[PDB]
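Box 3.1. Reading complex inputs
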Amino acid sequence: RKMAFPSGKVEGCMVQVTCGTTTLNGLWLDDVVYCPRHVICTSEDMLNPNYEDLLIRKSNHNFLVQAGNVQLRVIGHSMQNCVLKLKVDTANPKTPKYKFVRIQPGQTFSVLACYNGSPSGVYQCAMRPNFTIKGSFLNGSCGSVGFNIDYDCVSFCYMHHMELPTGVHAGTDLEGNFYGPFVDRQTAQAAGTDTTITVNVLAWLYAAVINGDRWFLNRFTTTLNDFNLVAMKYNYEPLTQDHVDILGPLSAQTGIAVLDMCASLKELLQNGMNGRTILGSALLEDEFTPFDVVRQCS
Amino acid sequence: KMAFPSGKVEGCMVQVTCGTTTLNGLWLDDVVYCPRHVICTSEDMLNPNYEDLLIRKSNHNFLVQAGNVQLRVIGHSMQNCVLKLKVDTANPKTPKYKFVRIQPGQTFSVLACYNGSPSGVYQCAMRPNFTIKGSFLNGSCGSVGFNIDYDCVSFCYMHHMELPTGVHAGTDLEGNFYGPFVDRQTAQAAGTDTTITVNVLAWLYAAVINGDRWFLNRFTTTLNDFNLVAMKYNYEPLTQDHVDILGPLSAQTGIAVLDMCASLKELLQNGMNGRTILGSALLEDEFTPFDVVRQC
Ligand SMILES: *[C@@H](O)[C@H](C[C@@H]1CCNC1=O)NC(=O)[C@H](CC(C)C)NC(=O)OC[C@@H]1C[C@@H]2CCC[C@@H](C2)C1
Ligand SMILES: *[C@@H](O)[C@H](C[C@@H]1CCNC1=O)NC(=O)[C@H](CC(C)C)NC(=O)OC[C@H]1C[C@@H]2CCC[C@@H](C2)C1
């Protein structure tokens, strides 16, 4: 199952940011609030905004930042790519240890879905190879963030900005750089065709082996290049060197070399399951990373 | 599959140790709640006479830790399968809360913890056979399940054990088990499980709301004729209150409840023929009608 990180350290950072009647969520860390820059847009400006021009018209006193009903005074503002940074006069006492990270496709993270600065729910998301996520976002959710927690430290990796015609979602890292080819404009935009996250399918096969479900292990191996060329014909992602390395721990735990598992997967792609199941499913799961597999099995 | 934000519960988790047994406790005001089997040794667990084992314990045999800080136990009592440890310190992070006993088919969020530290949060349902399909490992006992309404946390589950099939069992916060289970180290089977029909229907309505409707059809059915088929396939019967509960989703989608029942009947008799619904190859039954509504 999809297991999220405990959300409390992030709940303690959520605020709301309002310009006129446009309200979205912001992230309050130390004395800075981060939020999507389109908070400065009127509904009519979103159709195609000139962000630099809209911002020059704004002053600190135009931004309403609230933690609950308590206003936080803004003392400076700047735009960094597609995010606004609002300097406020109070350092957030609940600021966790944190960092800003830019994740790769296939990586998973927890989303704390928020409305009006109030958290509604937490769930696990995977960044697709086409740089969309299958979120559960409604109007007012922008500025909700995605994150991982490692020991004491919250790694923020996603801030929510928009929905695409197909129902999937797009956003930025906390430096305001979109994942994928998207722009924060209320225009119709299409994601590239999606593909299957090979490194996560391999993680899932390793998980199956750990649990004693290993009928699919074959006697063969392959080169990485040969595997990548075959996998693309089945709309699977090619593997990177980094993928091979993050499978290291599971390969060590099972004694199954990464390239042997690749050969087992190739046979499943070429011959199908033949009516068999793996971990109680005829479908190969691609939204559990190698870290997720280790998280849940211990 | 969306869980409630877990912060209000994280601020209540502590570590409870007795002997070489460690698990989690729930610290509310000046009381820590935890599974009573913490007082057992390996031998005691086979057939523990808990009242006899507990009378032999002193307050100082319980080590309670909230982070780096030890909380001194100044008294203890047992309520069914839960131990209540009175401590000298009040938890300033205690939320507004209540203890509820949930009904089968209801959902809740689980904050899985180890050594008093939160590790993950996820949504579970109380199965009709009163197990839960959780993800709990060694040391997870005392992890709790909850729902949040406005500011109020309703605690409904505390974790005690894993069955041979890999599913999980536990108590309400009064210490009464869900199901016919006992906190002893013996292999226990559950009753035959069934599928939560009202939840399957809610999930089908969710699939429609999200623009998927390949499973719809032009048939209909009476409630009783649907229930005959449901019971044949070990689905729970659908009551008239269930139908009422599903009204909002039926209105939203323009699909009468009994029409969706006819769709589910077709799926039960014909399978899915390799298709998927909301990504799943199986009919999902751990989303309630309220869950679907809150998220759509
Ligand atoms: C919490 O103390 C613990 C949580 C269990 C451990 C594994 N998964 C869980 O949910 N509860 C127990 O250990 C419980 C104590 C009795 C009620 C006195 N017994 C129990 O759950 O037995 C089953 C586990 C399953 C697993 C594989 C074999 C050896 C261990 C670990 C027994
Ligand atoms: C937060 O402000 C919202 C969150 C959105 C709304 C509902 N679900 C979501 O994920 N963000 C937006 O409304 C953005 C603002 C602009 C990027 C500045 N726009 C948006 O998401 O529009 C959706 C869009 C989808 C199709 C393509 C373009 C026209 C319509 C059809 C609407």
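In summary: The helical segments of chain A are 8-11, 51-56, 198-210, 224-233, 241-246, 248-254, 258-271, 290-297.
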